[PDB]
Short mmCIF file of C-alpha atoms and ligand atoms in Angstrom, two decimals:
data_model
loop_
_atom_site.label_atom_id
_atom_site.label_comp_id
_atom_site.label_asym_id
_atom_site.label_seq_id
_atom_site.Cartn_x
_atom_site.Cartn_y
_atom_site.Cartn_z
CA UNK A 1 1.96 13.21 -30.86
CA UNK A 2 3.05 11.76 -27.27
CA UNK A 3 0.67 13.73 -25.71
CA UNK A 4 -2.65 11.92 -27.05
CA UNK A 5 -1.46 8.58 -26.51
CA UNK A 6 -0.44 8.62 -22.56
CA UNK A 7 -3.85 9.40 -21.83
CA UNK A 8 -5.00 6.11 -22.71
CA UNK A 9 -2.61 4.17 -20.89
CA UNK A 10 -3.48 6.41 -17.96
CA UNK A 11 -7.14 5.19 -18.33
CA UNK A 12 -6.68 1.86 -18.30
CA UNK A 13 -4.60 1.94 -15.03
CA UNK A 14 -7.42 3.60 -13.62
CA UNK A 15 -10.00 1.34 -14.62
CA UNK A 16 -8.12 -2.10 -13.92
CA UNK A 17 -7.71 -0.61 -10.67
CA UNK A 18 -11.10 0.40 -9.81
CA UNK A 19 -12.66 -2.77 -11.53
CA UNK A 20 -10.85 -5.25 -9.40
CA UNK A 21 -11.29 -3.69 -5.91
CA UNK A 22 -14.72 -3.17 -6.69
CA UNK A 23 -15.53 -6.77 -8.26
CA UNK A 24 -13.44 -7.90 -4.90
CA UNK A 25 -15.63 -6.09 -2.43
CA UNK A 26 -19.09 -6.70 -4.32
CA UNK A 27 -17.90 -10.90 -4.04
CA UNK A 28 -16.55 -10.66 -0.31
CA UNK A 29 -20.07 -8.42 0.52
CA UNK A 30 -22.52 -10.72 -1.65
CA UNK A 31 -22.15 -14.37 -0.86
CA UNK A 32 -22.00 -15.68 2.80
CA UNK A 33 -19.17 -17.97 1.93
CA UNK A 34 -16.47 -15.98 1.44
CA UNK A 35 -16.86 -14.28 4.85
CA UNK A 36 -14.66 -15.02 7.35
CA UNK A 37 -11.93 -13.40 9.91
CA UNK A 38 -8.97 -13.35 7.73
CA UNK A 39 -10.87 -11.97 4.36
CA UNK A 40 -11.27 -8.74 6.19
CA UNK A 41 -8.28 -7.65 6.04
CA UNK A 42 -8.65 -8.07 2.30
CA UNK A 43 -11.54 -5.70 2.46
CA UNK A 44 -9.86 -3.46 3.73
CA UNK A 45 -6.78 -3.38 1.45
CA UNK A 46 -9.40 -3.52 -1.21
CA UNK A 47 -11.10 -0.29 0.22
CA UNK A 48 -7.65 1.16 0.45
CA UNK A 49 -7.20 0.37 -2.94
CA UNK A 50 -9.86 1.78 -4.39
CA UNK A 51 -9.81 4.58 -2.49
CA UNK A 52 -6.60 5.41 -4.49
CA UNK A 53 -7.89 4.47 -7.43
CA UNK A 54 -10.25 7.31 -7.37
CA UNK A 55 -8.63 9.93 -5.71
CA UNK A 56 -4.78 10.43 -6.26
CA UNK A 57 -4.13 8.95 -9.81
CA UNK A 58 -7.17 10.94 -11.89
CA UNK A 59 -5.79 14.12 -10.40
CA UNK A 60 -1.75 13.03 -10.74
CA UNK A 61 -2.45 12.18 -14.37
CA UNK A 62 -4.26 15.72 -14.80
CA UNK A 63 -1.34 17.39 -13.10
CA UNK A 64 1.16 15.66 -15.06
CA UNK A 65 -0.23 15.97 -18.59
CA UNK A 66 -1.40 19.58 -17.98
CA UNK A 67 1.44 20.43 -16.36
CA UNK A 68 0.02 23.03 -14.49
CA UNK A 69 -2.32 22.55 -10.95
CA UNK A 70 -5.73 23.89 -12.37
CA UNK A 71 -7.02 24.07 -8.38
CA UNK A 72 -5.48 25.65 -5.90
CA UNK A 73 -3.43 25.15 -2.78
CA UNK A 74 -5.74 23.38 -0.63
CA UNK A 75 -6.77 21.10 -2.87
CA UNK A 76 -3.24 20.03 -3.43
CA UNK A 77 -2.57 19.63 0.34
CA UNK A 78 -5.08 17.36 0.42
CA UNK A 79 -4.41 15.21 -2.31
CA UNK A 80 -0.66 14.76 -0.61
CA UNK A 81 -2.46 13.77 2.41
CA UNK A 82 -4.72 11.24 0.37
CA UNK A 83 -2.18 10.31 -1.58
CA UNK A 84 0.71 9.18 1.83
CA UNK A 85 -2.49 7.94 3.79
CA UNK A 86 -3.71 5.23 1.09
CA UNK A 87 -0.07 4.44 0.93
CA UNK A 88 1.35 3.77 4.25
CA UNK A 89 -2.37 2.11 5.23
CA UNK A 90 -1.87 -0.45 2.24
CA UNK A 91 2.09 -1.39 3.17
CA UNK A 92 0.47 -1.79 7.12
CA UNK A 93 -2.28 -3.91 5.51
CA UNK A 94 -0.21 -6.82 3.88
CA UNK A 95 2.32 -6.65 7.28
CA UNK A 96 -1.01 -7.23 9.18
CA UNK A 97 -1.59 -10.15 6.63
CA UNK A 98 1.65 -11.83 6.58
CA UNK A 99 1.47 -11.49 10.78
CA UNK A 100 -1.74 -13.35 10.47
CA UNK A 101 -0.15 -16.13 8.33
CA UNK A 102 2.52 -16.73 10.96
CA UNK A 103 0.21 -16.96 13.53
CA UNK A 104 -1.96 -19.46 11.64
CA UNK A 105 1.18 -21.50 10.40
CA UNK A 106 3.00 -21.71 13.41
CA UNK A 107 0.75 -22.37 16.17
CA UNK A 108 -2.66 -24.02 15.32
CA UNK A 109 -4.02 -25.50 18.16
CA UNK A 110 -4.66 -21.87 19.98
CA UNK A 111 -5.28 -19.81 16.74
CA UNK A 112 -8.84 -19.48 17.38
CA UNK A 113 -8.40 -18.32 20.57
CA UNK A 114 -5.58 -15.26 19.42
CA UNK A 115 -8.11 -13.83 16.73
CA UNK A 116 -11.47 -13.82 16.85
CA UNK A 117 -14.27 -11.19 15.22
CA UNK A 118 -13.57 -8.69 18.01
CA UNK A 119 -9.90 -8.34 17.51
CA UNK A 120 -9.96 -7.74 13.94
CA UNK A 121 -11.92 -4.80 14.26
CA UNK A 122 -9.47 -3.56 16.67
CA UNK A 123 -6.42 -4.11 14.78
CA UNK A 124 -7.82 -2.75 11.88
CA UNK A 125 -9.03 -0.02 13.51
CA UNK A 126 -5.66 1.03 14.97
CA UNK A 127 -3.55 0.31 11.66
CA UNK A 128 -5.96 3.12 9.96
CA UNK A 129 -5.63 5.26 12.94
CA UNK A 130 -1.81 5.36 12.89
CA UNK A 131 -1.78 5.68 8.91
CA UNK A 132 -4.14 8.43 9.84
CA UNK A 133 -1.72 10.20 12.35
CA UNK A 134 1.60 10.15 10.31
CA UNK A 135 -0.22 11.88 6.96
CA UNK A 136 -3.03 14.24 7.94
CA UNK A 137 -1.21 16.01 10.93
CA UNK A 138 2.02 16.19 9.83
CA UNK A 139 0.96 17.95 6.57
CA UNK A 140 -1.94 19.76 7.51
CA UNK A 141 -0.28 21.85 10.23
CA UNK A 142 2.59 22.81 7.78
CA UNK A 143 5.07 21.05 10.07
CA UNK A 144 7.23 19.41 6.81
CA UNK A 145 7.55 22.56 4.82
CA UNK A 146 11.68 22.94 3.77
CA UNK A 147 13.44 26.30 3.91
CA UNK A 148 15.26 26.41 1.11
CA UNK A 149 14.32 29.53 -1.59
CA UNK A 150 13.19 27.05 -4.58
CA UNK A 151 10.61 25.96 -1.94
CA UNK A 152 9.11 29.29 -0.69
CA UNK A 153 8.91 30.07 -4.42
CA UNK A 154 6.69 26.70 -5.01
CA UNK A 155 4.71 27.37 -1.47
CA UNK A 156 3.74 30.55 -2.71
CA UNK A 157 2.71 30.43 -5.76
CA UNK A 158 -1.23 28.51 -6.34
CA UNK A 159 -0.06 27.36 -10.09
CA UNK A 160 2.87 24.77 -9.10
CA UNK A 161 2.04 21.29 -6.85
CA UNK A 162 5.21 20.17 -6.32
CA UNK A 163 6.89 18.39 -2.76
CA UNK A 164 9.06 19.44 -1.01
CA UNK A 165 10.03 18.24 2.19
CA UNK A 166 12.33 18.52 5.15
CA UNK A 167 14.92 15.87 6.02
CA UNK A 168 13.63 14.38 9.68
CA UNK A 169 9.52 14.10 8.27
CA UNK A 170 11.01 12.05 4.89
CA UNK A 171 13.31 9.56 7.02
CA UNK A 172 11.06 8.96 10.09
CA UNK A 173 7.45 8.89 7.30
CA UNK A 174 10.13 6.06 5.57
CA UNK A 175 10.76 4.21 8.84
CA UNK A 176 7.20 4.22 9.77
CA UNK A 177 5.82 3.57 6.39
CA UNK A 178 8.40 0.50 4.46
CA UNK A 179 11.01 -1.00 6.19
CA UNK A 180 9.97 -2.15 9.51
CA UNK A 181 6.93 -4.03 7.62
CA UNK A 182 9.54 -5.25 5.27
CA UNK A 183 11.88 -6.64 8.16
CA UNK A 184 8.25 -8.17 9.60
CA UNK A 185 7.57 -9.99 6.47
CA UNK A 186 11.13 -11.40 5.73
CA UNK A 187 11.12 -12.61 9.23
CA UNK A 188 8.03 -14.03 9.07
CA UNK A 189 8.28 -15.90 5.74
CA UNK A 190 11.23 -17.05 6.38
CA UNK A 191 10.17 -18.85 9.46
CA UNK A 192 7.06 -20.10 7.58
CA UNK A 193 8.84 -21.49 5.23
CA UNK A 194 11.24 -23.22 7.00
CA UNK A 195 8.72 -24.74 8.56
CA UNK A 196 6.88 -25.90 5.14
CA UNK A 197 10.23 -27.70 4.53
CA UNK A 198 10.18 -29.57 7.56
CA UNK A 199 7.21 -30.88 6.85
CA UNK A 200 7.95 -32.04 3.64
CA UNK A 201 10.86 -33.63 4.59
CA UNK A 202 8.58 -35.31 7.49
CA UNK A 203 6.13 -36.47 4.69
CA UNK A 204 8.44 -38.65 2.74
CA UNK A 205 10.34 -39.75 6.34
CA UNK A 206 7.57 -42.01 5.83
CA UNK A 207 6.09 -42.01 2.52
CA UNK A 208 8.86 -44.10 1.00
CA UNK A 209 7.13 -45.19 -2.35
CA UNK A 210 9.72 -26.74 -4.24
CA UNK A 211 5.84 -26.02 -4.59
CA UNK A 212 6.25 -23.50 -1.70
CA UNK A 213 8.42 -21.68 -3.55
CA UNK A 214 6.75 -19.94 -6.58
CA UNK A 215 3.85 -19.10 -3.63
CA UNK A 216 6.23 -17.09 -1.72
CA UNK A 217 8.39 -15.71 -4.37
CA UNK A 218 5.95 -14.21 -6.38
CA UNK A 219 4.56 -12.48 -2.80
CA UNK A 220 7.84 -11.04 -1.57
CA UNK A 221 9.09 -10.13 -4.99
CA UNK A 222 6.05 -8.33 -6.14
CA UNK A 223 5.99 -6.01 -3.57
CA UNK A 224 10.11 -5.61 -3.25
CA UNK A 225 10.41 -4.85 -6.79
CA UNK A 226 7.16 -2.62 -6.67
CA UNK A 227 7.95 -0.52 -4.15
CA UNK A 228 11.69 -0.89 -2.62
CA UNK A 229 13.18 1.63 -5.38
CA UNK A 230 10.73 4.27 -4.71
CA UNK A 231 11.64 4.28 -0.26
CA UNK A 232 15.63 4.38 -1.76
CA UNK A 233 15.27 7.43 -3.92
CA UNK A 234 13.49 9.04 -1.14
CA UNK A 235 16.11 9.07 1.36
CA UNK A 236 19.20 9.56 -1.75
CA UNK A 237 17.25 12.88 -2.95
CA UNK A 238 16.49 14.47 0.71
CA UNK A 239 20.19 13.40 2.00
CA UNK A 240 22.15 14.63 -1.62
CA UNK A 241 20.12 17.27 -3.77
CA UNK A 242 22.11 16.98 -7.29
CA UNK A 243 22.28 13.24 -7.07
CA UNK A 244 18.69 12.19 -8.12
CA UNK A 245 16.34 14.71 -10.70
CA UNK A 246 12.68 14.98 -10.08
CA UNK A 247 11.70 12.99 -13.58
CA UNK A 248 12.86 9.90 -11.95
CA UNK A 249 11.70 10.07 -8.65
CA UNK A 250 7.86 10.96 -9.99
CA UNK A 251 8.65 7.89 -12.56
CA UNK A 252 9.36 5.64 -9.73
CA UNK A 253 6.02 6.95 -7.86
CA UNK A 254 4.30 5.91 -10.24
CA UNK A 255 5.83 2.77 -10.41
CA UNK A 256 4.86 2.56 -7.22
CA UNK A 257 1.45 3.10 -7.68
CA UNK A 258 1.08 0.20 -9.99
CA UNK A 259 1.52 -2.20 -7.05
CA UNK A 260 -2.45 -1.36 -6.23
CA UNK A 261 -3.78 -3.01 -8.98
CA UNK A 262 -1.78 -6.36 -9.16
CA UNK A 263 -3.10 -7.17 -5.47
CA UNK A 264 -6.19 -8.89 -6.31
CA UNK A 265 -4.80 -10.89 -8.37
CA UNK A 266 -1.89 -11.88 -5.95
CA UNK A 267 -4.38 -12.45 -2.81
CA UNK A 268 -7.53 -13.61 -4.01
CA UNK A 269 -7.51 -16.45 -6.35
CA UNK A 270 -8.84 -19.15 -4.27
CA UNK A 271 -11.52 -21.91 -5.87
CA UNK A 272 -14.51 -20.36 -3.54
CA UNK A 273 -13.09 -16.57 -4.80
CA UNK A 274 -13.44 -18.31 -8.77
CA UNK A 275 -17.10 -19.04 -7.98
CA UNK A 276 -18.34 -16.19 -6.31
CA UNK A 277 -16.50 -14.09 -9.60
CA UNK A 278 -18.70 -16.32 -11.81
CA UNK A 279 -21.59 -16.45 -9.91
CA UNK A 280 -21.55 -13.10 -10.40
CA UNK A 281 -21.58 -12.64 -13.92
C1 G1I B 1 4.65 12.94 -3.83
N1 G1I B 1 4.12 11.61 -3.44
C2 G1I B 1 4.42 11.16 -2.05
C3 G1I B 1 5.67 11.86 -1.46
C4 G1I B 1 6.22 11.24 -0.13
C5 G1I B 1 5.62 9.92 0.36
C6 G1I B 1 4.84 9.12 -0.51
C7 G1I B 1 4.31 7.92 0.01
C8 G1I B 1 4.52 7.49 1.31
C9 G1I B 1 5.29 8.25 2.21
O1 G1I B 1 5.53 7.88 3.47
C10 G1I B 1 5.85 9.49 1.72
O2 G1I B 1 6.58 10.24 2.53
C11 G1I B 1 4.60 9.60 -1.96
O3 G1I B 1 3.44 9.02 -2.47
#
């Protein structure tokens, strides 16, 4: 009665998801307008994006409805691989972003000079390769498996895809992955908009006969409320086992998870965006 009804929520997060990533990149790849050195880190948030998209919520929602792990144990590794890389390479994304901004803000006379279309490669290059590094060889080589017996049970057997992991690979993938961006992007807005304030001030100095604002609440507060309860949780459960149950913590995953799909929205609604989406259809 519960059962048959999920599944269609489920689908539409999927194909919200997958529709705007892919309208995104088919606009950014079509029209010789849109391209330019900051919109590619939007690419390739979008391609992280819908990279997730495809791969780790179709197989979560099979998992969870199911309630059993159809494939076996390789298949599941890999999908917690998938699943931490997408992750950790979107959080790195919008710090690279907000970086950008207070380079642009700040100091425009040599902004041209700092980035140009070699450097972005670079940089992007680099953020996937350390996104890369903390997911794929960590799990791969076994090196986060726990000890305790509730573990070796769910290791052994090939019906159960459940994680468990050991203390020191939760805290430092938590450092690495939230809360150093987060410190970057509070800093960083908050310098930006000071400075937004001084120049409205300096406007009416001489013009004598709050819009900033909205813009950088709705930015910080989408992603804080998206994904700052999941990166509490995480630490709470590893640090005290009977304090949080595994209901909630998958809840707030997928919570987590929603965060995807209200990006394009958030970072590309620009006039010259508007008319590439209706050129296109
Ligand atoms: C079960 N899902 C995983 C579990 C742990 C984890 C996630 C995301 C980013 C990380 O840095 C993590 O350590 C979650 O998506």
């Amino acid at each position: 009665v519960w059962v048959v009804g999920m599944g269609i929520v489920m689908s539409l997060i999927v194909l919200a998801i997958v529709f705007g990533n892919v309208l995104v990149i088919t606009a950014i790849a079509k029209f010789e307008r849109l391209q330019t050195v900051t919109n590619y880190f939007i690419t390739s948030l979008a391609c992280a994006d819908l990279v997730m998209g495809l791969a780790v919520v179709p197989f979560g929602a099979a998992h969870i409805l199911t309630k059993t792990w159809t494939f076996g144990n390789f298949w599941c590794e890999f999908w917690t691989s998938i699943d931490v890389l997408c992750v950790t390479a979107s959080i790195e994304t919008l710090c690279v972003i907000a970086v950008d901004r207070y380079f642009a803000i700040t100091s425009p006379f040599k902004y041209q000079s700092l980035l140009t279309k070699n450097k972005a490669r670079v940089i992007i290059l680099m953020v996937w390769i350390v996104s890369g590094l903390t997911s794929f060889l960590p799990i791969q080589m076994h090196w986060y498996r726990a000890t305790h017996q509730e573990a070796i049970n769910c290791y052994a057997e090939e019906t159960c895809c459940d994680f468990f992991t050991n203390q020191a690979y939760a805290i430092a993938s938590s450092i690495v992955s939230f809360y150093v961006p987060l410190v970057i992007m509070v800093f960083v807005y908050s310098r930006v908009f000071q400075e937004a304030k001084r120049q409205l001030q300096k406007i009416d100095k001489s013009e004598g006969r709050h819009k900033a604002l909205k813009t950088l609440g709705i930015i910080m507060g989408t992603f804080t409320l998206c994904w700052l309860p999941f990166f509490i949780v995480n630490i709470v459960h590893v640090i005290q086992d009977n304090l949080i149950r595994k209901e909630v913590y998958i809840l707030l995953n997928w919570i987590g998870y929603v965060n995807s799909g209200f990006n394009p929205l958030i970072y590309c609604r620009s006039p010259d965006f508007r008319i590439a989406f209706q050129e296109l259809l």
